[PDB]
Amino acid sequence: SGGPIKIIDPEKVSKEPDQLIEGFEWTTLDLTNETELQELWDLLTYHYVEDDNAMFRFRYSQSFLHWALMSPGWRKEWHVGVRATKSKKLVASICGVPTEIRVRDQKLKVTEINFLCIHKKLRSKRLTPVLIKEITRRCYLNGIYQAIYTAGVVLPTPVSSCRYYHRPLDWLKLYEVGFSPLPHGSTKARQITKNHLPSTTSTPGLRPMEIKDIDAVHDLLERYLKRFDMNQAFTKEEIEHWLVHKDGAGKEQVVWSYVVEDPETHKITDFFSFYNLPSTVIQHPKHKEVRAAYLYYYATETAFTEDLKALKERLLLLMNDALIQAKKAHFDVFNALTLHDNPLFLEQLKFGAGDGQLHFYLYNYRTAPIPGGVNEKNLPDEKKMGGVGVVML
């Protein structure tokens, strides 16, 4: 089951950060300041993807960054930066939001770390342990003794590893920008036919999530997520932040959520959500961006009957509707990982395997490795689920 690596006494934790390497200094980011938001945005756009031939890169936005970093309980002090002393330019960042997860039946207050970014010029200084140590020192002073973070590379011991999958929605666009390949002997018509979607949804009672649904989604999601070895815990205030889009001036929609109201009993029996994070096409004559949806949290009452056949059929129904709703909202591609129960539907719904991997890390906590939905060949396998029930951004 595991437990903490060290029990920490918050009165013995240093109140001042560690001295940095020669010419650099700590900073606290004020992301309500658009100039500082711009600094982080610029650092992330050019330095957050670890590989240097990436001819794609994520396009962040004020709405996305506010959604990711300003969740209930957020503090400026957990938006940490490093600046070069001479120029004051921002050269590294690590941001955390406080929440709770469960790890093999044990509930833990954590900081979920979501933009650990190091400028290309400082990768040789190996600052990752140094940033993690500093944000967690700040969390230790507030009674949070564990963290969870991710990476696209293997570092000393992921707790789990998941594979990225991609479902084209506008295959032709994806082909034109070099995102999707044309398989040998195939044709545009063949691939367009392959990825065709109905124009209407099939799940009876399906429709968009609303404020009144918060209590019911909270209960259902919590019951579903508790089934996984490592899973996110939600308060009702977190459900509303993370899942309910709020329309407002200067505000762009980041998350889409739908529920299924059973036509007879009128209870919420299913729900799913997805978020927008576009990828910039580094130069192309016709297309600037890939509008990408990422599958987020979902849940279904069918899970609790414990027969895999019925759960597969229900997820095939629900997630094909998720694809239809994304296509209706003009997304080009629908991305998902092998976590949750996703291997039950990825291949059938024509998600193609990606070369990306997401690796999960726990800080100050020891537990047995957790299955990530894939077998030893890195292929989805229903015997390797039940492990990862946290979606990190």
Author numbering: 17 to 409
What does the paper say about this structure?
N-myristoyltransferase (Nmt), which belongs to the GCN5 acetyltransferase superfamily, catalyzes the myriastate group from myristoyl-coenzyme A (myristoyl-CoA) to the N terminus or internal glycine residue of a protein by forming a covalent bond. This catalytic modification, reaction known as N-myristoylation, occurs in organism cotranslational or posttranslational processing. AflNmt is necessary for colony growth, spore germination, and sclerotia formation in A. flavus. The blots of AflNmt-GFP (green fluorescent protein) were found in the hyphal cytoplasm but did not overlap with those of the fluorescent nuclear dye (DAPI [4′,6-diamidino-2-phenylindole]) under luminescence microscope observation, suggesting that AlfNmt exercises its biological functions as a cytoplasmic protein.
